[PDB]
Structure 1
Amino acid sequence: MDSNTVSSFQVDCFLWHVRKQVVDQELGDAPFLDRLRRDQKSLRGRGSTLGLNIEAATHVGKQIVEKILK
């Protein structure tokens, strides 16, 4: 497992969480919702394959993105 495969997954988990909040705020259109559903399935499969816990990865992804937004 390369370091970058791990950081890529972490980021994608956190961005998925942000997109889910946009949908819970009723700001997403139909195709945005469809991408959210498809990506959740994809992320779970990648998480299974890598053996990475999704909640843990989501939290590291948040830290990576906060570092970047600074």
Structure 2
Amino acid sequence: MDSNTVSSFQVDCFLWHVRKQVVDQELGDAPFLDRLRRDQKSLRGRGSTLGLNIEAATHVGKQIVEKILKEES
């Protein structure tokens, strides 16, 4: 199992979160929400396959972003 896949997953996880926040802000058009839904189903498939916690994954992503932001605010 490639690690890059795990990292890419953690990213998609954090992203999905931020997205859900964008929708909760009542700023969803229709395609973004639809994609978020289809993304959730896919996230659940990977979450089950990988059997990795999405909540903890989102946390790791947060740090992954802060690490990339630390290199360039």
TM-score range, shorter chain: over 0.9
* Greater RCO structure (CA 8 Å; 6+ sep): 1
CA shift digits 1:21-60 (9 cap, x unpaired): 0000011101111011110110110111112111111110
Deviation at 1:12, TM superposition (A): 0.4
Q: CA RMSD in A?
A: 0.9
TM-score (norm 1): 0.92
Computing the radius of gyration from Cα coordinates, the structure with the larger value is 2
Deviation at 1:69, TM superposition (A): 2.1
Partner of 1:17: 17
Deviation at 1:3, TM superposition (A): 1.3
Q: Which structure 1 residue ranges, 4+ long, deviate > 3 Å from structure 2?
A: none
Report how many residues are paired: 70
TM-score (norm 2): 0.89
